[model samples]
Target chain A: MIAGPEALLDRPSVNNSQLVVSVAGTVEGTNQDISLKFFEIDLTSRAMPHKLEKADLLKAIQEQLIANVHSNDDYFEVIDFASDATITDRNGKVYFADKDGSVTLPTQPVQEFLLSGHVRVRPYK
Target chain B: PSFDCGKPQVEPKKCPGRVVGGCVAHPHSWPWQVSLRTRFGMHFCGGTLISPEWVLTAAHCLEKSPRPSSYKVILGAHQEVNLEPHVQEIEVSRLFLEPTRKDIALLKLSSPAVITDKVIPACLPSPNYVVADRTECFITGWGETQGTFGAGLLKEAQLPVIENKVCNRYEFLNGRVQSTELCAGHLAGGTDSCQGDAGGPLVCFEKDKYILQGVTSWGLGCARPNKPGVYVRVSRFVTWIEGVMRNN
Candidate 1:
């Protein structure tokens, strides 16, 4: 698998079914082209805490992304999320990925992110 | 003798069709009103003839056509295109805009206006005059009533002023309303100064004289709910207004 830099997500939610991958670099003075992908790792099988450390799961997703994915234009495109797609955390906080692709992050100050899931690589819709 | 500046004598016989939400004004009832026009003779914003040589209006109105030669102030005008014999048209010699974002402006006349029953200056608010909440005031303009067209004849409406505190506290406005600005309109909507009404007069009667309280500035829309008509508070700028008139 292609291994990239250790770019830790600021605040990632493990309870949600999806996570949005967004472009982080500047495309100025060049053609505006960016692609995104999603990776879901089964952290429950590891018997690890929901807010997992910067463990193998995070690294696995990063490596998997670089190997197979090219900067394809049709990658990670979806319509805006529904308004009612809100999730309440254990501490009584509501969160929603109201925008397409990216899960709406938690509003509270981002201390860290602990997540795990299986990366689904679909051919096309 | 000069007619009392603010008091418009009610003449029901003049406009027999005067009704609620209808366009009907008694002759010489609003003597201080003026229609600001372009050089090609297009009636646009409204202004108050505050003096023989000065007209007060909103500064934003001049941004579209800011040249003195481009503007011609029509005194005591009723119809838009057809300038009647009773109306007096004068060219703008100079314009004085406030240094700050006050939105108030003064237009110097090319020649001194001839004071008559139909064309007179409006009274400026006194230093001690405080506009209380729900104070009834009248706004007159050749502005739009519906769609893009203006009300052919001059139109007037009686609106109540909403307190600065109440207007700022509106959920839609979210405390963004300026303190130096005054608001007057029905909260439930349906009546207000529209697109062509900017730089017009918002006057109220105080002790037999109609004092100029505000100049129509900005609003969310024409007569929209929670979006009352806002005006530049004239009372706050009386000193500046008087100083300009006194010196220039």
Candidate 2:
């Protein structure tokens, strides 16, 4: 557990163009909970030229969920990001990126972003 | 006497074999393969035993914890869960990061590893060594297999060397491949070195021995179409490696 999105918001933007956010937690499927180990979201292509807003961070997270979590043919079908899932920082502070908010970036290449609560995932048919 | 290098006690089957994905490697077949783990014994990255006193791995591996004591180097390991008597667990005494290279690192063991049938050093390339395009090579690690982590057993895949020019043309990598780096994998996708395989060896057979050619660095994703796994070209850093070893 670590700080919320504010941890990313506190960093300088110039050195934060490209970042790798480490994600871990569970994808609560209808059948069982799937443990996601520390996989990374390489933000090399996702970072905004200016400051990274909460919307930007949310978009990156959503994209990764679709690309990595949802794209898996064997385990996942639908990752309900709109209502079921909650994203947090390493310290476990909840982030309401689904609403209007702001986020920061890491000065270094990587940071930790923990997924908490349940992201309703419908298993493969 | 000069210690023998790159000679695995149990010789692995020659590559270019017909396999869609990487196949399970014979135990101790890659004698120089190393497992870089957390102090509590979690396999995170892979490494190579370049010498009894040092290991070669990716610089990014230290991103988690730069402290030398934070890592345990496991040699002669094939399975993650099962313990084998031949495995040598050594503590890292120091880390020597290449000042110019962004993806290369050398680890000095707290004590030298004892050479045995199951443990040996990999042969380093010459300063000017150049690998040709389509040169067959092998990458080994306990990394992701079929989108799942913890493959549990060591796996080896055959990836032919790709020219930087061709590799750069890919939309994902673009022109980002540097002179100090090389590309290896299939453009058609399917087989590759994936996440958790970073810092592992990419050795190519030469004569009767295998030469350390590359260090796993990065890629768009695991075995993605048109995206080849990139590696730190070992040949480009041979001089720097020798300089560091000599000065220390």
Candidate 3:
């Protein structure tokens, strides 16, 4: 990633079959989208269980991504998550969306990623 | 990374904006006159309502448009005064949208507007709103037609919707075919939206009623065939739409 706002997704989503940098919010099992994604955002932030900080959080996410591979390309990609994709254009991606239409993006948050395990980072595509 | 704002043709006051574009003839009964004062410091056009209290418009429309308080809602009569809004003198409650998507925002009114068959609700695509290949649909607006800007009259036209792949061939557009966005253009450069039609509707006509398929997202001129016009895909936000409405 570009190491900036451009490195993150503009707006996050859990719809469609892709690795949504899920926001992790509400609803629980019923309204899975927001109800779930909202919780994820907050849970990942604190989550009580791990309470991962910057580095630990990234490592956890990387592991989850590796484990949730859908197809073979996803698996292979996760296996080689460290090796950046030349075609990857989102050097620095920053995503935002409110309850509806309006969206704004400014300075990206501090993000430093690392691989601290032997297992691959599953590409949840 | 912030760019210096001291460049050219940036602010609206300095440049009332260049002569933008035109679209097909779709009859739009406005709630008020198309002017800066009525809309007040708020800028932008093509703001269509998705729900009673919710209006869907373009992000670029609000880019340099106006503030929430300054803008007011008009109804029925395109000209100011004669007609009245469902809720006269409504103010924008809140605005929301996704940053990367470049989609516009929702202007939640202070009160719900009365939805009539004439002044009605745009049918948002159901769960399965995907059109795999090329799908043709009509696009309408109250902006430019052929000659000048702000047709002052709503107009519309039916154009064959090209596949996202074909559309991406144009410049400035960057999205996968499967992404929840599409492109439209008239190649000849005659038809497109510009000037006053900021948050207007980029309609997707289906059956008797129509779906607010896309907003007048953005375009090169009006209609430049090869220069596909980009629109915010409403289908992509089905969950967001439902979620927000549920919460609100």
Candidate 4:
């Protein structure tokens, strides 16, 4: 334990687990399909359980993909992930996890998830 | 002649009693408030004009580049879009970083600003000046509000000073509040200086002038419970500021 000004600013080190997930999909555009494979997102525990949730994981992936596409597409804005975007496991099974306290995601170092969505971009104003 | 500072052209209306959250500030009410932006015209942080040619802001705002040419300063600005005629856009000529704390920096404008009712300097606190806890102070900036960036208008919030004792609590900032910093906001946290407000002024009303007491620094998040906005204690850096201005 420590005391004084220096100790007060010392932050507690709490361990958080990380899960690597790869995206195998594309964002369908008006004229063509934009490959979203550029995203290799890492899901980290943000709360107590230290495990990723289905909703939280999807939200994170969508946000990352949108940001990635937005930064690269200077002339267009990547508004959001298409409403039809679906997530599947490596074994070709539709991925599902509990949103509440009962069930949780498995702790695996590397996980592969498939994603398919439509690209919603508009000309920059 | 001694240059008058900290007195705005138009005084803000007196508060009826206690106001909780921030509201749009009366145009040019805080004339010394500055908008520090990028060369591409993006307002990234707030600053205080201490002199016609000098601006004080948080050092972290310039972390991307120390080059003076990479930044711009706008004085007498109230609206982000379609600025009024009173606004003065100036180029930065030099940048000086405070060596010890590495949290405050000074920008020297390429030319001295024309002093007017709409453009003035803010008063700096005396060395080691200590403001009492719970002292009501005003923080003005064009930062985020309710998860959205300032709606193109300057915003001001009246936050009371929080003592380091309360600010350093384990449930609070976990003792991270330093002597060189000041904490201001409510424990319930309905208002604060968020991202893009960095380097802005936290001014406390003195006898007849507003003294620049703090420079907006960091916070846990915007308007969150137990998280008050942290600012650089301007009083602690008076000597350095004076020395830099005199020598350079």
Distance from true position, residue B44, model 4, in Å?
Answer: 0.9
**Model 3 agreement with the true structure over B122-221: per-residue lDDT tens digits:** 5567753754344544454445422211223444444445567766653535554346766554333322224235556544445433465555555532
Per-candidate Cα lDDT values, in order, are 0.60, 0.67, 0.41, 0.68
What lDDT tens digits, residue by residue, belong to model 1 across residues A1-125?
A: 32322234434444533322222211222212233343433323213333223323334544544555566532322211111122233343433221122223333342222222122222334
Model 1 misplaced stretches (Cα beyond 4 Å): A1-125, B9-22, B145-150, B189-196, B219-221
- What is candidate 1's local distance difference test score? 0.60
DockQ of each: 0.01, 0.02, 0.01, 0.02
Evaluated on the second chain alone, the candidates' TM-scores are 0.88, 0.91, 0.68, 0.91
Which 10 successive residues of model 2 chain B have the least lDDT summed? B143-152
lDDT of 2 by residue, B102-145 (tens): 67899999999999878889999999677999888888877653
| Backbone atom clashes (below 3 Å) for every candidate | 7, 9, 68, 1
Which ranges of candidate 3 are over 4 A from the true structure?
Answer: A1-125, B1-43, B64-67, B77-89, B99-102, B132-134, B145-151, B170-178, B186-196, B219-221
How do the residues B65-140 of candidate 1 rate in per-residue lDDT, one tens digit apiece? 6679989999977766667897899999988898767488899999989988778788898863569998877777
Count: clashes, candidate 3? 68
User: lDDT (0-100) at residue B179 of candidate 3?
Assistant: 62
